[PDB]
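**User:**
Make up any protein.

**Assistant:**
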Amino acid sequence: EVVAKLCAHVFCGSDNLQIVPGVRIPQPLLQQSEEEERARLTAILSNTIEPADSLSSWLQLPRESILDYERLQAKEVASSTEQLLQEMGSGSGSHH
């Protein structure tokens, strides 16, 4: 269903899609020049800049889930460090 919604957003669109909040992709023009349209899309890519919150803004998922995944990665690291510290004498907290 995630793939389905992304296909509903990226493909279905008329004259203005706004894949990301900053960029708008206009549908082909009446001049019907393919070199001109290539240059047009290259320019629409050159003008835009990837925001800092790109993983939460360009991807429709929110920022809370970003913080959660970061927390998860940190928890993995800390747990592995503690388990390594107990297997070779380095943890007074666990000690009894």
Notes: The chain is about 55% helix and 0% strand. The first helix runs from residue 2 to 10.
